[PDB]
Structure 1
Amino acid sequence: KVPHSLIYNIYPYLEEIRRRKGMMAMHPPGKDGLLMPDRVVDNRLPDHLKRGYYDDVYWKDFFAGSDEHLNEPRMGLRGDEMRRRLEEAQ
């Protein structure tokens, strides 16, 4: 059985039962919300292509020290920043 003390918890539920009339009860016609994959998409690029790919959108050498986003992590780097990596290595 349900204790008298705990019944308040049901209130919001019971509340939006009452309030579900009209548009809130309405679902978009045709659309279930479950969208299955159909095609296969890969936008990956060779490194030399993405070296200057985002220069106009952002600054040049956008992928510079990025290890995950480049196959060559050290390209585009100016000498100093290249030296930094070894500097912390030794």
Structure 2
Amino acid sequence: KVPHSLIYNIYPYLEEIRRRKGMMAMHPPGKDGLLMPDRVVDNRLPDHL
């Protein structure tokens, strides 16, 4: 681990607590099967554009 994830209270350090899982497995699938979350347009594009 990184040492600052062991003594400091910042919330993305909570991602250091859990084990490594695949980003296609945590995010919901698409029409074809497992899909990366940054390959769909509405996830990578902000809402004001």
TM-score by length of 2: 0.19
Q: 1:32 and 1:15, CA in 2 relative to 1: closer, same or farther beyond 3 A?
A: same
| Offset of residue 19 of structure 1 | 2.6
| Offset of residue 26 of structure 1 | 2.5
Q: Percent identity?
A: 100
TM-score by length of 1: 0.15
| Secondary structure of the corresponding residue to residue 8 of structure 1 | coil
Structure showing greater relative contact order (alpha-carbon pairs closer than 8 Å, 6 or more residues apart): 2
Q: 1:11 and 1:19, CA in 2 relative to 1: closer, same or farther beyond 3 A?
A: farther
| Offset of residue 13 of structure 1 | 2.6
Separation (CA, whole Å) in 1 of partners of 2:47 and 2:4:
67
Please, what is the CA RMSD of the aligned residues? Answer: 12.1
Segment of structure 1 superposing worse, 6-15 or 25-34: 25-34
Larger radius of gyration: 1
Separation (CA, whole Å) in 2 of partners of 1:46 and 1:4:
31
| Offset of residue 9 of structure 1 | 1.3
After the TM superposition, which parts of structure 1 deviate over 6 Å for at least 4 consecutive aligned residues?
1-6, 31-48
* Structure 2: gaps (5+ residues): none
Instruction: Give a deviation string over 1:15-63, Cα, whole Å, max 9, x none.
Output: 4475341489522222799999999999999999xxxxxxxxxxxxxxx
Larger % of strand: which? 1
